[PDB]
Structure 1
Amino acid sequence: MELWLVRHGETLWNREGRMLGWTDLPLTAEGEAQARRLKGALPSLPAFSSDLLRARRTAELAGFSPRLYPELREIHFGALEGALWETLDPRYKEALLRFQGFHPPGGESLSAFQERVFRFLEGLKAPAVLFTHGGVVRAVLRALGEDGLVPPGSAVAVDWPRRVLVRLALD
């Protein structure tokens, strides 16, 4: 099933390199610029969005009025929320780099994150645009056997759960 996944526009923690999960940060001015550029570049399909501000605002600026779902949220980093990637203990760094065996104290395990995300995707009855987060887009791309890193304010379309269709980035 055709699904478009949008990584929300940038927040301060992108340039700062801090782990951004459930911390509800707003978009930066450039983040809004990115979100606005998506208007007219995404298909007219039912829209769903993470309920976190940065996602919702991206969907709004993108000319959409999505139905909010917490299931589309970035992974919950727990105690690692706000920590600099640079200072993360190697065990966590490796876990995140290899996308496996990640269980932050007070947070959500990668396994639970994937289950949550994939269960939501399974429930979709028809093509739709999903305003979400880098980790969600990554989980989906990796499951489809490809590198999962995409720029803020960019999107990817996939034929779930079979293959990636296109990656769209704007300048």
Structure 2
Amino acid sequence: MELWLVRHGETLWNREGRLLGWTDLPLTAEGEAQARRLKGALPSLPAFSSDLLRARRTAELAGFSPRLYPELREIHFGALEGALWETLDPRYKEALLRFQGFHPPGGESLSAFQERVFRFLEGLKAPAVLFTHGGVVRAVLRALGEDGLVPPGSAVAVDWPRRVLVRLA
């Protein structure tokens, strides 16, 4: 089934290479500009969005009226929220780059995170546009034999659960 996965527009932390999970950062002015550029470029399918501000706002500026679901949230980084990637302990840095065996203290394990993501996709009955986060898009791409840290403000279409269709940046 055609699913479009859209990563929220830029926030400050995205520029500054900071871990951003459940911290509810707003879009920057450029992030709003990115979201507005998506309007009309994405098919007007029914929309769903993470309930975090930057996802909700991206959906709105993109011309959608999404239903909110906490299952589309980015992974919770717990004590690592806002952690500087530069000084991130090597054990976490390695786990993230590899996207496996990662469980930030006080936050969500990669396994719990991916389970809620894939189980949300399980409930979709028709093609939809999902406003969500980089970790969610990466979980899907990796399962489909590809990878990618898609930029903020961009989207990927996939034929769940079979293959990736197109990356729109």
Give the TM-score category using the shorter length: over 0.9
Cα drift, residue 165 of structure 1? 0.0
Detail structure 1 runs of 4+ shifted over 6 Å in the superposition.
none
The one-character-per-residue Cα deviations of 1:6-29 (angstroms, maximum 9, x if unpaired) are 000000001111100000000000
Alignment check: 8 A CA contact 1:139 1:148 kept = no
Of the structure 1 ranges 96-105 and 29-38, higher mean CA displacement relative to structure 2 is found in: 96-105
Alignment check: 8 A CA contact 1:18 1:82 kept = yes
- Give distance in 2, aligned partners of 1:117 and 1:79: 22
The one-character-per-residue Cα deviations of 1:5-62 (angstroms, maximum 9, x if unpaired) are 0000000001111100000000000000000000000001110000000000000000
For the aligned residue pairs, the C-alpha RMSD in angstroms reads 0.5
Aligned residues: 169
- Give distance in 1, aligned partners of 2:100 and 2:147: 14
- Give distance in 2, aligned partners of 1:105 and 1:147: 25
User: What TM-score does the superposition give when structure 1 sets the normalisation length?
Assistant: 0.98
2:45 match: secondary structure: coil
Cα drift, residue 161 of structure 1? 1.0
Cα drift, residue 148 of structure 1? 2.1
- Give distance in 1, aligned partners of 2:14 and 2:158: 25
2:119 match: secondary structure: helix
The one-character-per-residue Cα deviations of 1:66-108 (angstroms, maximum 9, x if unpaired) are 0000000000001100100111101001100111111111100
2:108 match: secondary structure: coil
Alignment check: 8 A CA contact 1:9 1:153 kept = yes
1:25 match: secondary structure: coil
Alignment check: 8 A CA contact 1:5 1:131 kept = yes
Alignment check: 8 A CA contact 1:4 1:129 kept = yes
> Where in structure 1 are there 5+ consecutive unaligned residues?
none
- Give distance in 2, aligned partners of 1:48 and 1:118: 14
Alignment check: 8 A CA contact 1:140 1:148 kept = no
Corresponding residue of 1:3 = 3
- Give distance in 2, aligned partners of 1:81 and 1:113: 15
> Where in structure 2 are there 5+ consecutive unaligned residues?
none
- Give distance in 2, aligned partners of 1:5 and 1:94: 25
